[PDB]
Amino acid sequence: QGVRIITNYGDLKFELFCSQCPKACKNFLALSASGYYKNTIFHKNIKGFIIQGGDPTGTGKGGESIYGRYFDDEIYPELKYDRRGILSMASASKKPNTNGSQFFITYSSLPQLNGEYVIFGKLIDGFETLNTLENCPSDKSHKPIDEIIIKDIVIHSN
């Protein structure tokens, strides 16, 4: 399945790994469908590393899953941070099975993250958009100066 993250800087299209990560994918889809991510921000943007959002509070401390506060990890060797635009759940290995609503998108291969967070999709379109996002200025605390806003996350058809 494909989803489209609609931002104030353009659209990001992701392929979801339904077969491998059904729990993470179902969470992401059900939260998206219920409008849980509408008018939220990416609160952390680190060039060459990751961009993180999916907190309704926008502080980096909030958000929950459809299963409760946390849900279990779907972590596999076959899914790796081996390319730009990987879609993952925020949480690490120190505190396992602590996935909520927050997610991040990678800016490059990041082998140090392998086994640490649930990967459940990858960017398949809107690479220009991701480039734009990477170049958006942030402050000392990695918070974008001008807000990067998720308008909606929709299931892509056609």
Side-chain angles (χ1 to χ4, degrees), residues 4 7 11 17 24 30 45 49 55-56 58 66 73 83 93 99 107 111 122 124 128 131 139 145 147-148 155 157:
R4 186 162 50 90
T7 79
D11 291 1
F17 305 142
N45 192 196
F49 189 50
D55 187 351
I66 66 167
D73 298 318
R83 71 198 70 184
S93 64
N99 304 296
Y107 287 123
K122 68 176 181 186
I124 56 162
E128 291 195 291
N131 290 343
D139 63 22
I145 297 161
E147 283 186 330
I148 310 170
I155 287 70
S157 48

Side-chain angles (χ1 to χ4, degrees), residues 1-3 14-29 67 74 76 79 87 118-122 155-156:
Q1 287 186 70
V3 291
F14 288 90
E15 171 192 319
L16 296 186
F17 305 142
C18 307
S19 298
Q20 289 153 298
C21 305
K23 297 183 181 175
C25 292
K26 195 69 232 257
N27 184 61
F28 193 70
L29 292 180
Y67 314 105
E74 290 159 309
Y76 311 105
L79 298 175
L87 179 62
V118 176
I119 296 168
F120 70 101
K122 68 176 181 186
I155 287 70
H156 184 84

Side-chain angles (χ1 to χ4, degrees), residues 1 18 33 44 59 89 103 110 117 122 134 150-151 158:
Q1 287 186 70
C18 307
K44 177 164 75 192
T59 59
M89 293 308 286
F103 63 92
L110 296 163
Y117 305 96
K122 68 176 181 186
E134 195 173 16
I150 294 169
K151 296 182 178 172
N158 194 101

Side-chain angles (χ1 to χ4, degrees), residues 2-74:
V3 291
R4 186 162 50 90
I5 301 179
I6 309 165
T7 79
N8 56 340
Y9 289 93
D11 291 1
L12 298 161
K13 201 204 274 176
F14 288 90
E15 171 192 319
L16 296 186
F17 305 142
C18 307
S19 298
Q20 289 153 298
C21 305
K23 297 183 181 175
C25 292
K26 195 69 232 257
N27 184 61
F28 193 70
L29 292 180
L31 293 174
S32 300
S34 72
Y36 196 83
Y37 293 126
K38 295 191 72 167
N39 213 27
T40 56
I41 70 172
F42 288 104
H43 63 274
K44 177 164 75 192
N45 192 196
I46 301 165
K47 184 175 147 65
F49 189 50
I50 69 167
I51 189 169
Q52 182 168 328
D55 187 351
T57 319
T59 59
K61 304 172 184 308
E64 289 182 348
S65 83
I66 66 167
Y67 314 105
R69 189 192 180 180
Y70 301 129
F71 69 95
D72 298 342
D73 298 318
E74 290 159 309

Side-chain angles (χ1 to χ4, degrees), residues 74-75 81 88-93 104 113-119:
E74 290 159 309
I75 287 172
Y81 294 99
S88 311
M89 293 308 286
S91 55
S93 64
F104 65 91
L113 299 191
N114 288 331
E116 300 289 344
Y117 305 96
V118 176
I119 296 168

